[PDB]
Design a protein around this ligand. Structure first.
Ligand SMILES: O=C(C1CC1)N1CCN(c2ccc(F)cc2)CC1
Length: 119
């Protein structure tokens, strides 16, 4: 029932994601010199350094907000991919499965703790 525990749990999950080779294309913002048309297709760029910085600045109120931004990294990759078989998109699918597998208990514990708080 710790309402604040999600934050360190998310920091540890981001550290694991940064250690994972599949996160390398997603660790920093989109390079517009490499992908000049990126902003023609993607309205809201997102990356893991921006997620980590938002968390460390105290700018996420809940793990659901962090989860929305991490999911945006993966949906941007899916929207920008020229093929469902591309290398970078394939890395995003594995990383998404790893993220979802680990974030589930973080969301569940936070939501349970908040329901207990408001009981
Ligand atoms: O510029 C970058 C990274 C160097 C920072 N990105 C924009 C293009 N993204 C992308 C996604 C799926 C795809 F299949 C191809 C590209 C990957 C991340």
């Amino acid at each position: 029932y710790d309402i604040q525990a999600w934050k360190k749990q998310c920091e540890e999950l981001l550290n694991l994601i940064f250690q994972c080779e599949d996160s390398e294309p997603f660790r920093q913002p989109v390079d517009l010199l490499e992908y000049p048309d990126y902003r023609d297709i993607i309205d809201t760029p997102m990356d893991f350094a921006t997620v980590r910085e938002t968390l460390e600045a105290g700018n996420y109120e809940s793990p659901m907000e962090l989860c929305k931004d991490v999911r945006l990294i993966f949906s941007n990759s899916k929207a920008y991919t020229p093929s469902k078989r591309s290398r970078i998109y394939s890395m995003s699918l594995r990383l998404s499965a790893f993220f979802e597998e680990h974030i589930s208990s973080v969301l569940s514990d936070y939501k349970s703790a908040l329901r207990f708080h408001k009981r």
